[PDB]
Design a protein around this nucleic acid. Structure first.
Lengths: 223, 232, 223, 231
RNA sequence: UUUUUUUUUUUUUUUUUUUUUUUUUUUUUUUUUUUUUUUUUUUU
């Protein structure tokens, strides 16, 4: 009853890869990305402080504070949330891709791994492995790795009134490799603007069902 | 809530024709059907869904009244990708096939005695739970069963438009409409019937919109009673 | 896998009184009726199937299906919900009152036991023990005991657009002692109409939120 | 946990916040300063939660280097413990101190001392709706709880903030009731609700014209984002 | 359908208690894809 008055994800990734490089494969991760949603829900229902969900055949200790009451429980730099997984695991896939040149293996990834959030906006692997994987949440942790895309997708989304600005706040504090938010907002402006044009010219069309159906339903007042 | 998650494949197409599966079904079963059997089913459908999501077996054989049948189970979490041939049965597909079977019965004759029996016997909890009864029409009453989006023509678009009205009122999550929107109107693609049969649909909607949408109906004696005290 | 095709509160009361006559007193009950609300809330947050809430110093096993998902879990004729307590417990108070003639004890009840729903409509013990206690939910289970008041309050409420009719449905199926809904709707019409006049002439303004305030808030688009 | 207790029935007592405020300033003016208070306002909710564990009737918490005798009935069992119009709860402190800060600001027109105050003292709730000192002192501090004790002094803002909050469905209307029974200096609610209606609607318009974000965003971020056509 | 269940109504008090609570490479709240497939709301 008496009163007075630093998380690095690059580090967290090395930690995470170490403990799990062993147990990972495409089919496991694929299944994670599909149910990233489903678990956010369930964990909000569970009152517990931790949980060990299983994706396919890869169980993992994640911290739960999706439950209403836990939302403010502090978290160590090696701890996992679904968000942090989504980020780390996205980065993993990219690393799997750049590992090699194999068109056969590259095609396996584009076949196995699938990103609903991206596909829901008509964006596919053909657009770019970076830009594709940037739609997964948690990629704001690795702006240099993902070429500002996780940011600029957000920017572009906010510009079209499809996202509440307050969801950018996560990304705007994050580093660019070894630069503070305050520094790179100043230095990397053109680079960011390049990375936005790149985002702008994607097809933001397909994904929202067929076009016929899009419109049909609009006729009877819906979205 | 036991936080086990699984794959969800693509395996595109499958070309499932419900009219095809329906005939195969009537052939194999017409023999063993009757209002008592079916009546029961429609009341224990959701019951049977829940119970199959415990039983880990791939196939099951439930029994309604005195009618047993081979259904495919993948209500159970792990089984949700088990592939299904266009003659096989899920609860869903039965609910659709049987809903149509009942319609055929009604339309078979104009016997006021047999229609009597049908209204009286068979019952759609979902319809009644929106304050809707047989008197609104047969086609519209049975369209409230799930599975009837397999036969959009046969039920005069009502399965689609019920869904649309449901969304328009924020009574339903739009994900659940998507089922219908990929279905056919007898011999058309969605792409086609969405383009052409728009007027026909808006009619079907108007009909659905003019139903006594109550949620939890009342008894008829209660209204005439309350109407004594100036309530209506 | 194989399929085919009624709760009597008079009985449920005897069961309930038996198991709890022992542990009850005014100060306990009083506290229940105050937090009847607060528990409806909390139980909706708890995912569990049962709960043992404590009112003052009287703990009790009640069935929870205030949680969204449990709402359809079937319930035995001896089981308690808050609603069924509220009813039973209301009946208990009346029985306490008619037990005796003691003006001293009668005054202890009017002092100890308090009904917000009644007082919020300006209705107090002076109106009648029956009519007062009829504002408590769950009294529809005992229409004969509470002289059609639980019903007619509802009727009168609906007449003044202060209640959605659909809340009367509970009461309209309930018995009058040993008569079906279908029978007494026919036979007891005058009696009901007497019990409604009785209701009509109470004071519906006082006790609640002051009329000045009612309006004030309306001016800034509020009720 | 579901452990329900009884409820107070006694009425009116007399708690005159202007009275209790002077007694308080008298007893404590001595020991107060921006550092102490600054701290309080940041650990107020912290202290609430901690007192609802400590079963004692009274407590003596300390902020910065300022200790004080508060009355605890955050603890479940204690919620009916009766309180004299000179005693302190966290709530009443929040109100008293919010007023103390205002007196400080108004004491002079020293741009140097106002500087210090804006810089030091900080209302998490105001900042967490995207509101800062620049919106005005009276309006900024009204976001503290307890300031409904002094509706005049804070230009109705404590009431109208609450109203706007409900109008937006950001708040449960039960929590407005506190204010609606309070005074406007020398009037009953009954009176000031009747008469000072225009004055209130003004105070509302002011509150409604605040930059109601929710969660701040650094000033550099806005000017940055304004390069890409975002505000 | 229901002698079921659930969702509105929960008193006065210049009283008391209960939601809001900034900086942060923290945390939480949006976006979650194709098939006349399958699963997941609707159930008198």
């Amino acid at each position: 009853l008496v009163f007075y008055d630093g998380f690095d994800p690059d580090a967290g990734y090395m930690d995470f890869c170490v403990k799990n490089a062993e147990s990972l494969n495409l089919a496991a991760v694929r299944i994670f990305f599909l149910n990233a949603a489903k678990a956010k829900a369930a964990l909000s229902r569970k009152p517990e402080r931790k949980a060990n969900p299983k994706f396919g055949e890869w169980q993992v200790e994640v911290i739960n504070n999706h439950f209403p009451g836990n939302r403010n429980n502090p978290i160590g730099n090696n701890d996992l949330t679904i968000h942090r997984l989504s980020g780390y695991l996205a980065r993993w896939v990219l690393d799997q891709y750049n590992e090699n040149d194999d068109e056969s293996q590259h095609e396996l990834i584009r076949t196995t791994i699938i990103n609903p959030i991206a596909e829901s906006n008509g964006v596919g692997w053909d657009s770019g492995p970076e830009i594709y994987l940037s739609f997964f949440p948690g990629t704001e942790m690795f702006l240099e790795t993902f070429k500002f895309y996780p940011l600029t997708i957000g920017i572009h989304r906010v510009k079209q009134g499809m996202m509440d600005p307050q969801y950018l706040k996560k990304a705007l504090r994050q580093r660019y490799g070894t630069l503070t938010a305050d520094k790179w907002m100043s230095q990397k402006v053109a680079a960011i603007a390049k990375s936005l044009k790149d985002v702008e010219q994607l097809k933001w069309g397909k994904g929202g069902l067929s076009d016929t159906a899009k419109t049909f339903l609009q006729k009877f007042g819906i979205r």
